[PDB]
């Protein structure tokens, strides 16, 4: 039973690693989506110039 509190505190935590884990593809996808959209902007502006 003490170990069951340990099961849940660890199962929660691991699922918060899969929380951050799906958010690994989610996070870095946004970092990539920045870098292309930056090169969409700076050039479109450069093409006005």
């Amino acid at each position: 039973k003490l170990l069951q509190e340990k099961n849940d505190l660890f199962l929660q935590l691991e699922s918060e690693r899969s929380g951050a884990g799906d958010v690994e593809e989610r996070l870095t996808k946004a970092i990539s989506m920045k870098n292309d959209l930056e090169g969409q902007v700076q050039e479109l502006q450069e093409r006005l110039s």
Binding site: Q40, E43, L44, R47
Partner: protein, 49 residues
């Protein structure tokens, strides 16, 4: 024998009998004859991004 080289770089079906199948009723006809050509615009260029 150069005759129809341009017809052949376009591959001849006596240059007619494709259009009506592209969007027909029958499934087996329409999946074979699905793959759409460049029907929207053919890209010109100019100045922009």
């Amino acid at each position: 024998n150069i005759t129809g080289w341009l017809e052949k770089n376009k591959d001849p079906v006596n240059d007619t009998v494709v259009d009506q199948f592209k969007k027909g009723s029958n499934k087996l006809v329409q999946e074979i004859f699905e793959d759409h050509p460049g029907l929207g615009a053919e890209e010109k260029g100019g100045g922009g991004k």
